[PDB]
């Protein structure tokens, strides 16, 4: 869970060659970053999309 | 009840004392076996209930 | 309960038809009344313990008011009427008079 944009993990199926379905999970690429919110130093879990966009 | 409403605050506080004291004596008489009119216990309790009601009514200004 | 306490009534359907009598006590919740003279039962009571004869209640719909009209007596049903101050007064219907 990105603390900025609310991007959460997605759920789906992992499919084999035999086409057997099992449950897996796409977790977003969330990196722990030290940031300054309101002049105060704080550590956040942020997704690289927010980093790339400059939201932090 | 109407007859009570004409009493002052102190008079109402008083009347509560005698009401409480009277019930006290009736309870003792009943326990010791000398009570004759069982209905009095109920009667005095209702008077006791009235006096609080009027005292509270004055406090809240109803 | 139209049948008040202390009225003159007539048993219209029972072991003792005809007999008039006063209304001793009325039970307006179970719809029964006591008419002195009718259904006089003999209770076997023990200890002065012995046979005692007192009247048992009869159903209210088995009696009916007696109003006096032109000499002799006549049984009547009862209606109501306001006078001027919204006061219902038992009004006889056989005669139209005020009971």
């Amino acid at each position: 869970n990105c603390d900025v944009c609310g991007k959460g993990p997605g759920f789906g199926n992992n499919i084999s060659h035999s086409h057997r379905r099992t449950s897996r999970r796409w977790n977003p690429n969330i990196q722990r970053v030290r940031a300054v919110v309101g002049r105060t130093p704080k550590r956040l879990n942020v997704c690289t999309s927010c980093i790339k966009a400059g939201k932090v | 009840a109407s007859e009570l409403r004409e009493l002052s605050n102190e008079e109402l506080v008083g009347k509560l004392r005698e009401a409480k004291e009277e019930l006290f004596n009736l309870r003792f008489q009943a326990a010791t076996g000398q009570l004759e009119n069982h209905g009095r216990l109920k009667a005095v309790r209702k008077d006791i209930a009235r006096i609080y009601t009027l005292m509270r009514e004055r406090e809240l200004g109803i | 309960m139209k049948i008040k306490k202390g009225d003159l009534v007539q048993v219209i359907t029972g072991k003792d038809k005809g007999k008039q009598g006063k209304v001793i006590a009325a039970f307006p919740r179970e719809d029964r009344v006591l008419v002195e003279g009718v259904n006089r039962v003999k209770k076997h009571t023990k200890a002065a313990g012995g046979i005692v004869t007192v009247e048992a209640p009869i159903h209210v719909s088995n009696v009916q008011l007696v109003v006096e009209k032109d000499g002799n007596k006549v049984v009547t049903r009862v209606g109501y009427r306001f006078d001027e101050n919204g006061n219902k007064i038992r009004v006889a219907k056989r005669t139209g008079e005020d009971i």
Binding site: - | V13, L16, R17, K20, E21, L23, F24, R27, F28, A30, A31, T32, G33, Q34, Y52, M55, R56, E59 | -
Partner: protein, 97 residues
């Protein structure tokens, strides 16, 4: 004084106890009362002193469990009670009768 901050000692003293043991205790100037279960020995002492204007020496309290009783339908339990035995100073007495 108001109608919420009003307290009368006669509420603590529910009633006296009449019994052979209580009668035997009268001769020793120990009076047994049934008191409000929420009262403590200190309240009992103050209540008796104010109600009867007597000098209380000691107060003992007995907590008695209600007696379970059988009925047609099943089992009921009488009320629990708290009994206080008040020992008075020499020469002081209470007329409970």
């Amino acid at each position: 004084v108001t109608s919420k901050t009003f307290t009368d000692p006669r509420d603590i003293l529910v009633k006296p106890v009449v019994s052979e043991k209580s009668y035997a205790l009268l001769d020793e100037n120990k009076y047994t009362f049934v008191v409000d279960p929420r009262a403590n020995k200190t309240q009992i002492k103050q209540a008796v002193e104010a109600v009867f204007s007597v000098k209380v020496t000691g107060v003992n309290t007995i907590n008695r469990q209600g007696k379970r009783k059988r009925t047609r339908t099943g089992y009921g339990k009488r009320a629990n009670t708290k009994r206080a035995i008040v020992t008075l100073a020499e020469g002081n007495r209470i007329d409970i009768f």
